[PDB]
Protein backbone atom coordinates (compact mmCIF):
# COMPACT_ATOMS: atom_id res chain seq x y z
CA UNK A 1 0.00 0.00 0.00
CA UNK A 2 3.12 2.17 0.08
CA UNK A 3 3.37 4.96 -2.48
CA UNK A 4 6.48 3.25 -3.87
CA UNK A 5 4.91 -0.24 -3.67
CA UNK A 6 1.23 -0.07 -4.71
CA UNK A 7 -1.11 -3.03 -4.48
CA UNK A 8 -1.37 -3.15 -8.29
CA UNK A 9 2.42 -3.35 -8.72
CA UNK A 10 2.43 -7.20 -8.84
CA UNK A 11 -0.05 -7.00 -11.73
CA UNK A 12 2.62 -5.64 -14.07
CA UNK A 13 5.12 -8.33 -13.06
CA UNK A 14 2.60 -11.14 -13.40
CA UNK A 15 1.30 -9.88 -16.74
CA UNK A 16 4.85 -9.43 -18.04
CA UNK A 17 5.72 -12.98 -17.01
CA UNK A 18 2.55 -14.22 -18.72
CA UNK A 19 3.22 -12.19 -21.88
CA UNK A 20 6.85 -13.34 -22.11
CA UNK A 21 5.62 -16.89 -22.70
CA UNK A 22 2.33 -16.02 -24.45
CA UNK A 23 3.76 -13.98 -27.31
CA UNK A 24 6.83 -16.18 -27.75
CA UNK A 25 4.55 -19.23 -27.88
CA UNK A 26 2.33 -17.49 -30.44
CA UNK A 27 5.34 -16.72 -32.62
CA UNK A 28 6.77 -20.22 -32.17
CA UNK A 29 3.39 -21.72 -33.08
CA UNK A 30 3.14 -19.60 -36.22
CA UNK A 31 6.66 -20.64 -37.19
CA UNK A 32 5.99 -24.30 -36.44
CA UNK A 33 2.72 -24.28 -38.40
CA UNK A 34 4.17 -22.56 -41.46
CA UNK A 35 7.31 -24.71 -41.47
CA UNK A 36 5.22 -27.85 -40.98
CA UNK A 37 3.07 -26.94 -43.97
CA UNK A 38 6.24 -26.46 -46.00
CA UNK A 39 7.84 -29.70 -44.80
CA UNK A 40 4.72 -31.76 -45.44
CA UNK A 41 4.40 -30.17 -48.88
CA UNK A 42 8.00 -31.01 -49.83
CA UNK A 43 8.15 -34.51 -48.32
CA UNK A 44 5.60 -35.82 -50.84
CA UNK A 45 8.15 -35.19 -53.61
CA UNK A 46 11.47 -35.43 -51.71
CA UNK A 47 10.99 -37.68 -48.66
CA UNK A 48 14.78 -37.85 -48.16
CA UNK A 49 14.78 -34.21 -47.00
CA UNK A 50 12.26 -34.89 -44.21
CA UNK A 51 14.81 -34.66 -41.39
CA UNK A 52 17.06 -32.03 -43.00
CA UNK A 53 14.19 -29.57 -43.51
CA UNK A 54 12.91 -29.73 -39.91
CA UNK A 55 15.38 -26.99 -38.92
CA UNK A 56 12.79 -24.16 -39.26
CA UNK A 57 10.54 -25.94 -36.75
CA UNK A 58 13.51 -26.30 -34.39
CA UNK A 59 14.44 -22.62 -34.65
CA UNK A 60 10.83 -21.60 -34.12
CA UNK A 61 10.89 -23.54 -30.85
CA UNK A 62 13.95 -21.69 -29.54
CA UNK A 63 11.79 -18.56 -29.34
CA UNK A 64 9.66 -20.48 -26.85
CA UNK A 65 12.84 -21.22 -24.87
CA UNK A 66 13.58 -17.49 -24.74
CA UNK A 67 10.06 -16.74 -23.54
CA UNK A 68 10.23 -19.51 -20.94
CA UNK A 69 13.60 -18.21 -19.71
CA UNK A 70 12.26 -14.68 -19.31
CA UNK A 71 9.12 -15.96 -17.57
CA UNK A 72 11.23 -18.01 -15.16
CA UNK A 73 13.59 -15.12 -14.42
CA UNK A 74 10.72 -12.66 -13.91
CA UNK A 75 9.13 -14.91 -11.27
CA UNK A 76 12.31 -14.53 -9.21
CA UNK A 77 11.52 -10.92 -8.29
CA UNK A 78 7.72 -11.29 -8.15
CA UNK A 79 6.15 -10.56 -4.79
CA UNK A 80 3.17 -9.00 -3.07
CA UNK A 81 5.11 -6.03 -1.65
CA UNK A 82 7.15 -5.12 -4.70
CA UNK A 83 7.76 -1.60 -5.96
CA UNK A 84 6.08 -0.13 -9.01
CA UNK A 85 9.57 0.27 -10.48
CA UNK A 86 10.14 -3.49 -10.22
CA UNK A 87 6.69 -4.22 -11.63
CA UNK A 88 7.25 -2.00 -14.65
CA UNK A 89 10.75 -3.43 -15.14
CA UNK A 90 9.17 -6.89 -15.25
CA UNK A 91 6.45 -5.70 -17.63
CA UNK A 92 9.00 -4.06 -19.92
CA UNK A 93 11.18 -7.17 -20.02
CA UNK A 94 8.18 -9.40 -20.70
CA UNK A 95 6.84 -7.13 -23.44
CA UNK A 96 10.28 -6.82 -25.04
CA UNK A 97 10.92 -10.55 -25.19
CA UNK A 98 7.33 -11.36 -26.15
CA UNK A 99 7.04 -8.93 -29.06
CA UNK A 100 10.56 -9.72 -30.26
CA UNK A 101 9.87 -13.45 -30.12
CA UNK A 102 6.55 -13.02 -31.91
CA UNK A 103 8.22 -11.12 -34.75
CA UNK A 104 11.08 -13.62 -34.85
CA UNK A 105 8.68 -16.56 -34.97
CA UNK A 106 6.66 -14.97 -37.77
CA UNK A 107 9.83 -14.34 -39.79
CA UNK A 108 11.16 -17.84 -39.09
CA UNK A 109 7.88 -19.38 -40.18
CA UNK A 110 7.68 -17.45 -43.44
CA UNK A 111 11.34 -17.84 -44.40
CA UNK A 112 11.43 -21.49 -43.32
CA UNK A 113 8.38 -22.28 -45.44
CA UNK A 114 9.98 -20.54 -48.42
CA UNK A 115 13.33 -22.23 -47.81
CA UNK A 116 11.97 -25.76 -47.43
CA UNK A 117 9.87 -25.31 -50.57
CA UNK A 118 12.85 -23.92 -52.49
CA UNK A 119 15.56 -26.27 -51.24
CA UNK A 120 13.92 -29.42 -52.60
CA UNK A 121 14.11 -27.85 -56.06
CA UNK A 122 17.55 -26.29 -55.49
CA UNK A 123 19.66 -28.00 -52.79
CA UNK A 124 22.08 -25.05 -52.75
CA UNK A 125 19.37 -22.96 -51.07
CA UNK A 126 19.60 -24.83 -47.75
CA UNK A 127 22.56 -22.69 -46.69
CA UNK A 128 20.73 -19.48 -47.58
CA UNK A 129 17.60 -20.63 -45.76
CA UNK A 130 19.62 -21.45 -42.64
CA UNK A 131 21.37 -18.07 -42.79
CA UNK A 132 18.14 -16.08 -43.09
CA UNK A 133 16.54 -18.17 -40.33
CA UNK A 134 19.49 -17.35 -38.07
CA UNK A 135 19.02 -13.69 -38.95
CA UNK A 136 15.37 -14.03 -37.91
CA UNK A 137 16.18 -15.89 -34.67
CA UNK A 138 18.80 -13.36 -33.57
CA UNK A 139 15.93 -10.85 -33.33
CA UNK A 140 14.28 -12.95 -30.64
CA UNK A 141 17.76 -13.23 -29.15
CA UNK A 142 17.97 -9.42 -29.04
CA UNK A 143 14.59 -9.29 -27.33
CA UNK A 144 15.91 -11.81 -24.83
CA UNK A 145 18.98 -9.64 -24.25
CA UNK A 146 16.89 -6.52 -23.65
CA UNK A 147 14.69 -8.48 -21.24
CA UNK A 148 17.78 -9.66 -19.35
CA UNK A 149 19.16 -6.11 -19.21
CA UNK A 150 15.88 -4.87 -17.76
CA UNK A 151 15.69 -7.78 -15.30
CA UNK A 152 19.21 -7.04 -14.03
CA UNK A 153 17.78 -3.76 -12.66
CA UNK A 154 14.59 -5.29 -11.24
CA UNK A 155 15.57 -5.55 -7.55
CA UNK A 156 18.61 -3.29 -7.24
CA UNK A 157 18.40 -0.22 -4.96
CA UNK A 158 14.67 -0.99 -4.62
CA UNK A 159 13.03 -0.14 -1.29
Amino acid sequence: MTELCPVYAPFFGAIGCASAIIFTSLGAAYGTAKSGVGICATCVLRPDLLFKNIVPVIMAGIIAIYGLVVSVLVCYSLGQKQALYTGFIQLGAGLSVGLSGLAAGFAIGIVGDAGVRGSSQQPRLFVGMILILIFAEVLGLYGLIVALLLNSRATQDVV
Binding site: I58, M59, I62, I65, V69, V72, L73, I134, L144, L148
Partner: protein
Amino acid sequence: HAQLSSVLWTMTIQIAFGFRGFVGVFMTVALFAMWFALTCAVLVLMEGT
Protein backbone atom coordinates in the same frame (compact mmCIF):
# COMPACT_ATOMS: atom_id res chain seq x y z
CA HIS B 1 24.16 -18.59 -24.03
CA ALA B 2 25.21 -17.90 -20.43
CA GLN B 3 21.66 -17.08 -19.33
CA LEU B 4 20.15 -20.13 -21.04
CA SER B 5 22.83 -22.34 -19.49
CA SER B 6 22.18 -20.92 -16.01
CA VAL B 7 18.39 -21.18 -16.36
CA LEU B 8 18.66 -24.75 -17.67
CA TRP B 9 20.84 -25.66 -14.69
CA THR B 10 18.28 -24.04 -12.38
CA MET B 11 15.28 -25.83 -13.88
CA THR B 12 16.94 -29.24 -14.35
CA ILE B 13 19.66 -30.15 -11.84
CA GLN B 14 19.26 -27.56 -9.08
CA ILE B 15 15.78 -28.97 -8.43
CA ALA B 16 17.19 -32.47 -7.89
CA PHE B 17 19.49 -31.28 -5.08
CA GLY B 18 16.64 -30.58 -2.65
CA PHE B 19 15.17 -34.08 -2.93
CA ARG B 20 16.77 -36.89 -0.94
CA GLY B 21 16.31 -40.62 -0.50
CA PHE B 22 15.35 -43.15 -3.15
CA VAL B 23 12.98 -40.65 -4.76
CA GLY B 24 15.76 -38.08 -4.60
CA VAL B 25 18.18 -40.41 -6.37
CA PHE B 26 15.64 -41.28 -9.07
CA MET B 27 14.79 -37.60 -9.58
CA THR B 28 18.49 -36.75 -9.78
CA VAL B 29 19.06 -39.42 -12.43
CA ALA B 30 16.05 -38.40 -14.52
CA LEU B 31 16.74 -34.67 -14.21
CA PHE B 32 20.41 -35.08 -15.13
CA ALA B 33 19.38 -37.12 -18.17
CA MET B 34 16.93 -34.39 -19.21
CA TRP B 35 19.53 -31.67 -18.56
CA PHE B 36 22.17 -33.43 -20.65
CA ALA B 37 19.66 -34.04 -23.45
CA LEU B 38 18.58 -30.38 -23.47
CA THR B 39 22.21 -29.24 -23.34
CA CYS B 40 23.40 -31.40 -26.24
CA ALA B 41 20.22 -30.48 -28.14
CA VAL B 42 19.89 -26.70 -27.88
CA LEU B 43 23.03 -25.29 -26.25
CA VAL B 44 25.92 -27.35 -27.63
CA LEU B 45 24.28 -28.19 -30.96
CA MET B 46 21.78 -25.44 -31.76
CA GLU B 47 23.13 -22.48 -29.78
CA GLY B 48 26.47 -23.61 -31.17
CA THR B 49 24.90 -23.41 -34.62
